[model samples]
Target: MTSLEKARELLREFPVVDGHNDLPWALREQVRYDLDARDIAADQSAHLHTDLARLRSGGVGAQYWSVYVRSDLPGAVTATLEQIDCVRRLIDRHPGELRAALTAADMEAARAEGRIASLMGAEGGHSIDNSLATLRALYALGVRYMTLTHNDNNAWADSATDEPGVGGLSAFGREVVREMNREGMLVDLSHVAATTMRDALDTSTAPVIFSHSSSRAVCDHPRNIPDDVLERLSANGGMAMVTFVPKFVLQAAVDWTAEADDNMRAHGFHHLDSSPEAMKVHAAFEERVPRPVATVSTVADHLDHMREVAGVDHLGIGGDYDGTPFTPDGLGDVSGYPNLIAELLDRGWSQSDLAKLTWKNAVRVLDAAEDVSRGLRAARGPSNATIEQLD
Candidate 1:
């Protein structure tokens, strides 16, 4: 068999357990949660980076669907609930193809049933609204992970893009980590500041994750993981799932996207806007000034460095599909996962290492979290400490 064929065959046994995808948010933006408006059962390439057919072709065994709301959005808790509902609704609409997975065993079951295991991760702490009750409620709703911050810092924690206020986790922020550990919710550190990442590491007894982040040393984006944090993953027993977002993986793309962001604002659109009008503005801006493009090799470069720093057991893929305005050339959508696998195979990555990168590590992290939660539950009851009281 050809190398590409071999990669495809390998995926049959160990398909990717991607850490994040934003198809629910994409649906929310495009059709306001009307699944019929942009049915995944049909081709949706023109409107999104994900759909049922492509997800099947992508050989995705499991996916952590990011139920994300903009941090600046008011009533974020409500918006987050809607996002979760949208994901669950989509799963129900495609029962034959998707199975809602809440645990590592569930993930394995989905794979055995030949369906993609659908998992949920809330992308920011704001969704909890400073209430442990809300946090617990979200966990009860099948949210297996909660990123501490988005692009903006919430009251208790700091974000990578926002100015630091608390420096790291405040008393309440640490409490949030502890509670997450007790509840078996993976504390995701992707959009958090380095200080916050370090602080969460120090606080949580369970493994944590960077759901969709790349290596900061490779790209110099605060959204990416630093070497120190990457190194800590080995001991923390967590993993950093490298993202395909260009600005986070490619250094040259970083400066270009900044210019593009400014142009978007100048055109009276949000920098993160993906509306048709915003696309027009983006196209026009690109016509005048070329945009730096990232490719499969660029993403591979990150995995290489990350493996060197964090070890193979603590690494995985998180494509950030349907979440970003642009994607790496060869990894433009979910179906492109094989191309990445092919690239890694050609790079002398062993089947064992590839297995860890693609599936084993993610399952291990969640399983470890569950084990930690059991111990913590035996030792202590749920934390009732309020942010107002602790912060």
Candidate 2:
């Protein structure tokens, strides 16, 4: 079989799962409607990373739709709630092709039925507006994971881009971690500051996830985790889902300053830093930046480093497609996942190891959270208070 054919065959049988994707945002911004729209799923726009047909063709068995609320959005909580509902509505409208999956069993069942197991993940804790009751309601609505912070810090936790060490997790942040543990929601540490990541890992009773992040050792980006943080994640039985965002992967090699200059020249503007259009132009320019001969190997090297520090069991994949402006050349879109599998195979990773990195590790982390929540409930027994009273 040709490489393409082999990739197709392997994908069909490999049981692949994407831990993080911003398909909902694409559905909203690009498609301008629900994902259930026929043309939206059919076209598979050049810019976006995924669609129903593309997902099916790519052999994606389970996908987590990020319920991301931009930090600057007005009434962020309500907007996030609406976005979550929108995903649920999409699943409900397309029950034959997709369905919400809240557990490992749910995912397996959906796969067995030849349906994509759709799951929800809140991308920022600010969506809850610091209300524990709101968090509980989101959990009840089938949100399986919640990243503690996004690009901006909120009342509970600090972000990677926030002032370093000035604001980690507060006392309420610790309580949030414990509550998430009690409620079976996976704590995602993707965009958190180093200190916040450490504090959350220490406070959490279940395995945490860096849902869409890369390695800082390879590229010194704030979004990437450090070696010590990787060690903590591994020690806590968590997973670091490697991201594919080009800037995060090759920040040092890419002349970001030059890229900005080129973007400014192309746009006939003074600064090219604010809008997505400028960022896209900048990303395009950065692509031409001279990379070292073995720069492509940097991704694999980081994977190797993560394995060394966090153990194989704690490693997984989160491509961050559709959410970022650029990705590594060979790892461009959702369709490019086969190249990743091929690279791992070339690196002497067994099929079993491939399976763990692609899907099993994420499942294990989710299951760990569920198990911890079950134990907590078993020990505490049921509460007698009403929902309002509890709030």
Candidate 3:
């Protein structure tokens, strides 16, 4: 059989348990919470990189849909809750293809049933609005992970892009990590400062994840994971889920995107703006600027480096589809996962290694977190612990 065909065959049993996708947020911008307007049951290729048909084609067995509201948005908790509801509604709308899976067991069960497992992740800590009750409330709502920051710093946690005012995590920030461990919400360190990453790693009893980040040594983005921190994953029992956002993965792309962001500022638009008008202006600016195109090999190089350092058990995939404005050349959409797998195979990655990267490692990490929760529940009740007292 062809290598590509064999890769797909492998995926049939253990499809990609993607760490993050932003389809819900993409829908929020395009259709105003109207699933019918962009019903993914049909091909949404014209509109999004993610869709039911492409997910099946990509061999995705489980997905964590990021219910992200812009951190700058007012009433973040209210807005984020709606994103969660939207993900739930989308699952409800497609029963045959998607099933809601809240635990590691549920994901396995859904896979056995030949259905795609669905789960939610709040992309930023801003979603919790500084209330431990709100954090616990999100866990109850089935959010399995909450990233500590976005591009901006929160009240407790310092962001990678923002200045390091808090140094790392505040005493309240440490409390947040503890509460996550108690509640079994994976403390995601994707967009936090190096100091914050170290703080979370130092504090979390359970496995912490960088739900969507690439290697800083490769791209030099503050948003990427440093090799020093990457070295800690084995001991911390956490996996830094490799992300596909071009600027985070490719060094050349980073400078290009910064220029694009500069153009955005020149036009008075935030680079994160997904508004139609803003996109139009940015597209026009890009037409005049030379941009770098990342390829499947560029991402696989990250996987190769991470595997060499963090080992196969410490790697997983989290393609930030629809979250970023662009994708790598060979990886245009969800359907391109096989292309990535093929690239890795060409790089002499064994099927066993591919299996772990595709799904096994993610399942193991989640399972480990569940095990930690059992002991944690016995040790303590909910954290009514206040940030005001702690900080």
TM-score of 1: 0.95
For candidate 1, write residues 1-391 as lDDT tens digits: 7768888898999999999999999999988988898999999999999998998888899999999998886999999999999999999999999999999999999999999999999999999999998999999999999999999999999999999889989999999999999999999999999999999999989889999999999889999999999999989999999999988888889998889999999999999899999999999998998888999999999999999999999998999999998998989899999999899999999999998999899999999999999999999899899988998
Error of 2 at 228 (Å): 0.8
Best by the lDDT measure: 1
Candidate 2's C-alpha runs over 4 A off are: 1-10, 31-40, 252-298, 381-391
lDDT (10s digit) by residue, model 3, range 48-85: 99999999999999999999898886999999989999
Clashes of each: 0, 0, 0
- In model 3, the Cα lDDT at residue 85 comes to 94
| lDDT (CA) per prediction | 0.94, 0.77, 0.89
lDDT ranking of the models: 1, 3, 2
TM-score of each: 0.95, 0.86, 0.95
Report the C-alpha lDDT of model 2 over 76-187, residue by residue, as the tens digit.
7777777787788778777878978999888878878988889989998888777788888899988999999988887768999777543678777877788889889999
Error of 2 at 101 (Å): 0.3
Give me the displacement of residue 29 in model 1, in angstroms.
0.9
Clash pairs detected, candidate 1: none
Error of 2 at 84 (Å): 1.0
